[PDB]
Amino acid sequence: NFPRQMLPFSKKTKQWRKDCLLWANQKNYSLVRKSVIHKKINY
């Protein structure tokens, strides 16, 4: 889960920022985009 963004700049520590990137590796759905499986067949 994505860590709390509603924090002071003092508590946005180096492990806070590493937690946001670790969540990004954990990782797609949008509302106005086709799938990547859809677009790759088109390409």
Binding site: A24, K27, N28, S30, L31, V32, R33, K34, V36, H38, K39, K40, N42, Y43
Partner: protein, 151 residues
């Protein structure tokens, strides 16, 4: 036609807040030509260079800097070819995405592979600037990682 020039939207609309900012710039060029010129040998060469900038406006000085930044980098990068490849993405998947970053202290513009960009919390918005979170995942050269993150 590719004539993408930065223009003043209202070129006949000068205000006093633009006039004060012009006066700060003109006096700042007064001090540096006072230091850099050695005792009236080249002071009147700089002075003839500076007098024709009184004709200008603050919005003129800004519209020149914006164009010189855009004129050089369109020709340096061949940006019309970058836009041609993304238009081919537009007629294929319906997505034309470009990233502007600083790499090596330079502004640089890249086109994004639509299969390698994740857009989150955009809403029903059509534009990609309106997203709250974007993830970009690609496989980079080791030279490109050292060209980008050496510091």
């Amino acid at each position: 036609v590719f004539d993408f020039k930065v223009v003043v939207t209202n070129p006949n609309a000068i205000s006093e807040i633009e006039d004060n900012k012009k006066n700060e710039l003109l006096q700042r060029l007064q001090e540096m030509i006072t230091d850099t010129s050695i005792s009236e040998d080249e002071y009147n060469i700089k002075l003839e260079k500076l007098n024709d900038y009184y004709t200008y406006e603050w919005q003129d000085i800004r519209e020149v800097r914006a164009n010189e930044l855009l004129n050089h980098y369109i020709k340096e990068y061949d940006i019309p070819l970058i836009f041609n490849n993304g238009f081919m993405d537009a007629m294929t998947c319906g997505e034309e995405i470009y990233q502007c970053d600083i790499v090596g202290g330079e502004p640089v513009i890249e086109r994004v592979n639509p299969l390698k960009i994740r857009i989150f919390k955009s809403g029903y918005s059509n534009k990609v600037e309106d997203a709250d979170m974007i993830i970009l995942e690609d496989y980079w050269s080791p030279g490109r990682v050292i060209d980008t993150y050496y510091d």
